[PDB]
Amino acid sequence: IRPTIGQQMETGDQRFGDLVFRQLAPNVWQHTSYLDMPGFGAVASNGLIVRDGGRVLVVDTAWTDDQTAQILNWIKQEINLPVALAVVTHAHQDKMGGMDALHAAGIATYANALSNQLAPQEGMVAAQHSLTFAANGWVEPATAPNFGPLKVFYPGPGHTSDNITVGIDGTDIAFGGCLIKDSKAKSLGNLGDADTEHYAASARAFGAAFPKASMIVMSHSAPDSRAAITHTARMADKLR
């Protein structure tokens, strides 16, 4: 309803149980789930849902298994196609807290190899499959089969050392996950697992890997313009 961190509800948003869904393009929706800390309030976290042909691809879980099952129920009701796979963008609760729910549903899960290696140490269940990346950041094609329009890019360490990003070919949309903050943000969020030396280059690498995208989607704000990339990089420049 009214998050302490993350974007507020707005027109075009549809509420479904404890979640909020927003259509970004004919075949792309943003999913939002909330972690309610008592004495603090709710923290919104955003992922994506993509319809590619006759299947659904998910980017990021919700905070919990129950919330992620609710995402799968919303897909069932609104899209009514099989969910082929999910990619999770790093090993923290807001992006991988729901992995058990995906596995129980028979959905194949993919994450950066480093995310799977860090998962147990971060309290997460590892994905079933590991993505690896070239030196230029692009996913090694053989590790990401049947990804449809998803273009998976590892920009370098920033918010975490394992954070990855996803563009949707054929759309105006690129997803920065927790690496990218909105153009009006005052801070870079939780830096406790962050690489302050490389953060700025990582944000600029994300921008150069998805040069066309005009809708920048991120974990804790509403979709923004490319000004979110420039602003994130400039706040990061001050960390070094």
Beta bridge mates, 56: 51, 83
If you ran DSSP here, which 8-state letter would residue 170 be given? Answer: T
Query: By the 8 A CB rule, do 113 and 131 touch?
Result: yes
Query: By the 8 A CB rule, do 167 and 153 touch?
Result: yes
Determine the Cα–Cα distance for residues 177 and 83; give it in Å rounded to an integer: 20
Residue 186 within binding range of a second copy, rule CB under 8 A: yes
Where helices occur in 79-142 by DSSP H, the ranges are 93-96, 99-104, 113-118
Q: How far apart are the first and last CA of the chain?
A: 37
- Beta strands 13-16 and 19-25: pairing type? antiparallel
Of the pair 94, 195, the CB lying nearest Zn ion is at 94
Of the pair 64, 143, the CB lying nearest ligand OL6 is at 64
Q: Tell me, by CB under 6 A, how many residues bind ligand OL6.
A: 17
Of the pair 5, 139, the CB lying nearest a second copy is at 5
Determine the Cα–Cα distance for residues 89 and 112; give it in Å rounded to an integer: 8
Residues 66-105 that bind a second copy (CB under 8 A): 92-93
Site string (143-182) toward a second copy, x via CB under 8 A: ----------------------------------------
Q: Which residue has the tokens 């309030």?
A: 41
- Beta strands 83-88 and 19-25: pairing type? unpaired
Determine the Cα–Cα distance for residues 110 and 50; give it in Å rounded to an integer: 15
At 117, is the secondary structure helix, strand, or coil? Answer: helix
Of the pair 31, 92, the CB lying nearest a second copy is at 92
Site string (174-193) toward ligand OL6, x via CB under 6 A: ----x----------xx---
Residue 5 within binding range of ligand OL6, rule CB under 6 A: yes
Q: Which stretch binds ligand OL6 (CB under 6 A): 21-29, 33-41, 99-107, 130-138?
A: 33-41
Residue number with the smallest Cβ distance to ligand OL6: 189
Burial (CB < 10 A; 0-12, 13-18, 19+), residue 2, is exposed
Site string (122-161) toward ligand OL6, x via CB under 6 A: ----------------------------------------
CB of 156 to a second copy, least distance (A): 19
As annotated, the binding site for Ca(2+) includes 65, 100
CB of 106 to a second copy, least distance (A): 29
Residue 28 within binding range of Zn ion, rule CB under 5 A: no
Positions touching ligand OL6 (CB under 6 A) are 4-5, 35, 37-41, 43, 92-94, 178, 189-190, 219-220
